Amino acid sequence: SISVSAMESYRSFRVPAINVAQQPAVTLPVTTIVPDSPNKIYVGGLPTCLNQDQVKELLQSFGELKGLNLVMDTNTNLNKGFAFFEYCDPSVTDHAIAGLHGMLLGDRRLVVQRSIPGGKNA
């Protein structure tokens, strides 16, 4: 499951994932708050002092980002060290999860794991 399960469930038409239901009907793809899309990839291993500016250059290093949610802890005013990004329309998505799976400037690294909401029971 999840491993390329919900392969392109949203190709043409269709409002952004998880919209118009028990959640206020918004417009096209949401802001920093990334929806639970099939292109939603997990990031684990981010510096607390890292910003979206420097985070996106790495995350979009393979393909262009549709959006990404850098969860910050309000008390610290710093990042938790993990995030989630959605890829726009890059065929490199799989390669990104492979290459960026440990690609960070310096001695640091970040994990990249699919968080695709695709059950695919059958």
From TrEMBL:
Role played: Necessary for the splicing of pre-mRNA.
Mitochondrion is among the record's keywords: no
Family note: Belongs to the splicing factor SR family.
Name used for this protein in its record: Splicing factor U2AF subunit
All copies of domain RRM, residue ranges: 39-117
Molecular function (Gene Ontology), one example: mRNA binding
Covered range of the whole protein: 204 to 325 of 449
Any single Gene Ontology cellular-component annotation: nucleus
Compartments, record wording: Nucleus
Top-rank lineage group of the source organism: Eukaryota
Source organism phylogeny: Eukaryota, Metazoa, Ecdysozoa, Arthropoda, Hexapoda
Gene Ontology annotations of biological process type: mRNA processing; negative regulation of RNA splicing; RNA splicing
Keywords: mRNA processing, mRNA splicing, Nucleus, Repeat, RNA-binding
Keyword Lipid metabolism in annotation: no
